[PDB]
Amino acid sequence: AMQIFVKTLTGKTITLEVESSDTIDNVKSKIQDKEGIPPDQQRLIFAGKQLEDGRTLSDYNIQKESTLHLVLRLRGG
Amino acid sequence: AMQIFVKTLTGKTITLEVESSDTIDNVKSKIQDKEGIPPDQQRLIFAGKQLEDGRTLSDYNIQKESTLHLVLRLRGG
Amino acid sequence: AGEIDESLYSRQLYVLGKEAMLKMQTSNVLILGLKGLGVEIAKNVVLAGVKSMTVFDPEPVQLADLSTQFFLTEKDIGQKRGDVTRAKLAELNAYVPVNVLDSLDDVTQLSQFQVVVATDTVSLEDKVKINEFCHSSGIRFISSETRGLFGNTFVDLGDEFTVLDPTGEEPRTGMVSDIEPDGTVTMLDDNRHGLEDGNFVRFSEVEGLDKLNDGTLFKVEVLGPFAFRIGSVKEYGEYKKGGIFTEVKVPRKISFKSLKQQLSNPEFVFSDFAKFDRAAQLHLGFQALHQFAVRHNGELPRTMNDEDANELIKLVTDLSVQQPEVLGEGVDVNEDLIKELSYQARGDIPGVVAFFGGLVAQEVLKACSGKFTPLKQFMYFDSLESLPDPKNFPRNEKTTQPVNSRYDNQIAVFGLDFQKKIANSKVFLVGSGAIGCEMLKNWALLGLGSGSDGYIVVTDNDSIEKSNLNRQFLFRPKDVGKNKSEVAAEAVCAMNPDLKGKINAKIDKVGPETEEIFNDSFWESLDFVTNALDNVDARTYVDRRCVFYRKPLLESGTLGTKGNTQVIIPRLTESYSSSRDPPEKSIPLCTLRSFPNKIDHTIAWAKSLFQGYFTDSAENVNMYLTQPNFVEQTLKQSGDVKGVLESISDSLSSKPHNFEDCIKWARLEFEKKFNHDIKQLLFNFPKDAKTSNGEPFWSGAKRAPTPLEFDIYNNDHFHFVVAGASLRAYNYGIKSDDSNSKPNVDEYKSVIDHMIIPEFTPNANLKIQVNDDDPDPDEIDQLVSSLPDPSTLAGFKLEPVDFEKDDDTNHHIEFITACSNCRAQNYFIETADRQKTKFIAGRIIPAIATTTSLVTGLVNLELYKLIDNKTDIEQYKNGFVNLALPFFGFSEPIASPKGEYNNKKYDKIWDRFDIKGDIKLSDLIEHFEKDEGLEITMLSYGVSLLYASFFPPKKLKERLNLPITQLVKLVTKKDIPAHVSTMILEICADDKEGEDVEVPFITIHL
């Protein structure tokens, strides 16, 4: 039962509840349930790297209070 | 568990971690994750040979510390 | 001075930059020796523009020197090489004086020069003396030698040399979304930073970390494709938002060693990594060639001579015993290699001379400027795969001996018979621009097409423009306006009169619309085809014809210092089309229309405005006034009905009567586009506006714009009006007041100052799309009624403008530069100058002669392999180069993909079923079963289905007895036109197992 933060391109910080054994999919799905953005469109980075869907927060030593970065894959604008 | 290098036509040097049994396919996807180029558009040459999608690094005797070259066709003249 | 002529140096300037060229224009260059190698180097350096070029070669011209020296004629025999060549070099470029050095007895004269180049006419002893003097005096030294299919070059720029830009690439740049206290910089959404460990960057527009923006450089530690780290930024404050990073290229100091030191301890750059073990062998070999000449009164080994080849081998062997470290402990002398170096020592081969000529010229420009990374310091090269199979063209002292011919030193390598087959070749060259000119020059030197069975066909639809002269060396200022192909062909006939009457210069574009010209009989008669093009569409088209007619294709390309070559061999390799290149980027419409953040976005916007104001508008009026069904057709056939009708309404209600009216219009357009439209945008989205989620609308890559207040003293405001006015006037046949002068600010000011400018009133129902995906973009009726009847406007016509980037007097680039820049001021984007605007809006491709020569050189080493009909894929070489680095890579062509049906192998690119005659359908089906074991299942011609195994008897009875042409007529209702001689049919088929199998296509020969 831990908290992490996700920053978007607009400066917005999203707060999530996760366990260190959750997968990147889970986090993407959790972002959907809270923000409405769908998993297919999320690309999450931590310390410069893109996070692969099958691994866990633990695999990347992502800790409670950690900050990830959320991108939307680019299209329009 | 080895390292190889990919030099591009612009002078950029990319470092990869691969095992000697990886396919050319594998390597090209690592280059996509790093450079953004899609595998169909990548042209890689090593020691006189252009690397083809179905083969392994071992088939081209690529050793640790080897340097591959990512090259382009130019449209002017 | 301190002044660069853009009308001449345009495309080169985009390669080297102003600063590098300014340094070049203060550099005096000396070249020692004017055989082929020296004159290639000199040609390229003179084209590039240096302060002066001086040539030293007192030796008498002999017939054999004409092997690669394209400025010598037989009239010149007897006279000194230096003198005869001077005047011809001088015509290449009126800005570059070319002098002759009468003597070199006093070495002190070398102090006049910044770069000294010693070619193959200078002995190794004199090279070392001269290098010692240059190095100890701070003069840049370069040397080069070619021998048959072998060559080398050596670079020594002294103890202290500074590289100012290592690659010539655009600095990487990007938008920042976050900067953490530890220095971690994360990119704004799916943008990759592209940096590399140890690059440097500066910042601007970073909020919350103010002294990060002062121009300090930070060292880049790459974390991944989407983030890099610059080290703690706690001391600087706390990140809030925004920010752009820009890469900064820093100076780098390097040292070179003298020729003497490098002879015993060379630093190698490889020309072909598949051959790296050869560099050390050849470095010994070239030294041995000099020892041989010392021992034999200055002579090189004789051609194909065994006695001398053994001596050269002994010499090399002696060197490796004395210096075990050169080949390495235990490593043997490659005797076959050394043998051929001896056999070919006297050879003078155009493709090799062209390769080193371009490479060495480029190093001279590096030495003058600090632009690009010098070769450091020895490079060796061979093209031994170019040798023909000795079974077909035996090589020996008899076959290879001189014949008192300009081609003697090519015969020295290949034999008389091979040289004759080169003469009797029939070739098609597509394009007569930069590559085309170099290509024709090499072919003139080879004697290609000069035999009674040979010929050359060259075609280009374009005429000669001024910027062409900088890299298309067959053209002269007096030639501007004439046709490239025609002038080129005359130029090379002057170089080699054996081609008189043998070159057919055509003026046609190659593509689908010219097949009645370049027909079956034309293609089938060729031995091979050579591209010299500047677009992907033409390359694809030729490649497709070559596959169809089964002809080899030699392909090449450049972009600045980068270049490539590709070979395409019938029944052996992939073709050009078999592989994909990365495609052009596309800017989302919403970004162009409402949310620009780069000068590229404002340039495209302004380019469209230009098009609509001065071209589309005019064509629309002329159509409306001459077609009474124009509106009706618009209403139903145009996507943008509103726009087209507004264009006409506006074009006819203003109607200027004098130049003053044109000024008034342009000033009002300024108000519309740079004030009112921006206020309208800020009305729908105030600065502090938010979205459906609580988040600030103006964020990410959207910059909040500010309206402009017209200011005649601001360069961009002023030129927007001057260019707008003059362009309007042209459309309306009105005389410009700046038609015979420059524009007078106070005159414009006077007209504008008495104008009354209508105030902004918002439109509360206007909607602006924020995403592309999103939508959407009774009144149209009123629009149509507002239009005046053509009855009123008898004889009224508008004169549309045709965009022309290379005429500096026409106001076009003036208008787009000013218009882009105003919009840039709206959105706080840095303005760009005319040169940068011309580059982007004109889509100019950067180009230089050095890369063009060198790439054409490689192409011509590959040509030899076509003459020998080589069928071993391993012998051919695709090349990839970047002269900036300098880098050279080669690779074996990819094999054509193969297939199989009923155990019968076939080539999926090259193989087809050829069929003679307008065969009956029934006969075709039976032929395929009996002779191929294939059950035809589907037959089609283009987009129409001619036969299917599932057809009912009624249909089959109508079709089975029809010749193919009649079957096509039956289905398409259109007859075959008479010019058509072949028909391609696609089929599906089953094999003897009842399974569908991929098979070759069918060609019907009528």
Ligand SMILES: *O=P([O])([O])O[C][C]1O[C](N2[C]=NC3=C2N=[C]N=C3[N])[C]([O])[C]1[O]
């Ligand atoms: O690269 P450069 O501009 O110096 O030379 C290219 C040359 O090719 C010609 N060209 C382009 N497209 C063509 C063509 N010739 C014939 N057919 C087609 N489709 C161009 O006019 C240049 O002179």
